[PDB]
Amino acid sequence: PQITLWKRPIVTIKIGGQLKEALLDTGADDTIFEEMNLPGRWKPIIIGGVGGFIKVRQYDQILIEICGHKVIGTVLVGPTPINVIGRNLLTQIGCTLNF
Amino acid sequence: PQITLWKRPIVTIKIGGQLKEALLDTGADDTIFEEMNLPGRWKPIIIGGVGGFIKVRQYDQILIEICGHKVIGTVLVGPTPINVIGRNLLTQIGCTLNF
Numbered sequence: 001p002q003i004t005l006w007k008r009p010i011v012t013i014k015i016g017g018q019l020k021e022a023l024l025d026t027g028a029d030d031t032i033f034e035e036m037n038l039p040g041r042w043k044p045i046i047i048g049g050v051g052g053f054i055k056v057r058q059y060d061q062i063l064i065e066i067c068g069h070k071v072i073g074t075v076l077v078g079p080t081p082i083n084v085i086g087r088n089l090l091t092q093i094g095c096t097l098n099f
Numbered sequence: 100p101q102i103t104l105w106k107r108p109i110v111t112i113k114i115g116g117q118l119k120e121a122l123l124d125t126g127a128d129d130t131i132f133e134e135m136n137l138p139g140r141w142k143p144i145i146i147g148g149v150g151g152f153i154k155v156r157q158y159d160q161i162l163i164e165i166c167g168h169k170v171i172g173t174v175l176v177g178p179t180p181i182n183v184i185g186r187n188l189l190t191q192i193g194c195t196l197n198f
């Protein structure tokens with residue numbers, strides 16, 4: 001699909017058996033999700049944004065289905081104000097900016 | 100241009116007679132720039148992102164040239180770690196996500 005930006009480019013995704021919505025964020029190097037029940041081991045991680053830093057848990061090789069497109073990559077889980085699909089996963093679906 | 104996302108989608112822009120680099124950020128509703136003494140009046144504003152909120156100065160109807168494309172819109176000035184072109188200006192150059 002081609003997505004214009006008059007509204008937030010929020011898409012439907014499937015992750016860890018749960019249904020969720022996430023923001024296609026080209027400004028996000030990596031994917032981050034609000035608190036959620038993922039399986040497996042994880043490592044504490046500290047990320048940064050406009051307002052400062054938050055502590056999150058990094059999970060690797062996580063299967064996501066982004067708007068019917070499957071991808072496997074790192075997914076951080078922590079106190080983000082919204083679920084964000086970062087460039088680490090956008091590249092796998094072949095996402096591009098156009099103008 | 101069509102921009103892939105293996106690298107940060109950073110473009111060269113002209114603002115207030117100054118040259119700067121900024122991130123094409125579909126996750127940003129509005130444009131935010133590091134400190135710069137733009138001319139004119141402004142109104143205090145508080146925005147929020149990952150890690151909390153920051154206080155910024157809001158200027159309206161500011162001319163930016165994004166990759167040689169002129170646009171006029173709101174530009175926030177404050178302690179952001181990186182210049183971000185938000186959706187308020189991306190729509191004016193017709194920027195879209197494609198995959």
Ligand SMILES: CC(C)CN(C[C@@H](O)[C@H](Cc1ccccc1)NC(=O)O[C@H]1CO[C@H]2OCC[C@H]21)S(=O)(=O)c1ccc(N)cc1
Binds near residue numbers: 047084131181
């Ligand atoms: C919560 C986000 C969806 C909103 N943000 C845009 C987003 O692209 C920021 C923009 C951004 C970019 C660099 C530094 C700070 C903020 N990226 C970001 O927070 O990235 C962090 C979370 O995922 C990781 O990816 C790399 C950094 C981590 S935001 O910078 O806070 C923002 C909010 C409101 C406006 N008007 C403009 C920008």
